[PDB]
Amino acid sequence: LKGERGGYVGQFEQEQRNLPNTGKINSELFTHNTIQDDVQRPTSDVGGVYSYEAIIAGQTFVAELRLPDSLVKQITSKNKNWQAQLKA
RNA sequence: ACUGAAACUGUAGUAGAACCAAUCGGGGUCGUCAAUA
């Protein structure tokens, strides 16, 4: 057997009788350069180019803000629609 | 217990070399035609 490592699993319950659904995040490598301005070209491949992995667009993620009732009462007293302000 | 910043995948390189749209040909010249009764 090989141990599992990466990825994410969906919900599961004691008698589900199906494996949990897996989720995968699509990443791509992006490559960029700096131009040396006098020669107007990159100064070498080794120190002229750089790369970023990024999570690509169109993917959906869920976070949770957790706040105690103490602060939620304060926030709701100042703005009843405050959850509308979380859209950004 | 708090998102790093900032950085042009650019720089040089002629889709080109070679190949005949060509070879042969007098603008010429003479015997009939038709099938029945």
Automatic annotation (TrEMBL):
<protein>
    <recommendedName>
        <fullName>CRISPR type III-associated protein domain-containing protein</fullName>
    </recommendedName>
</protein>
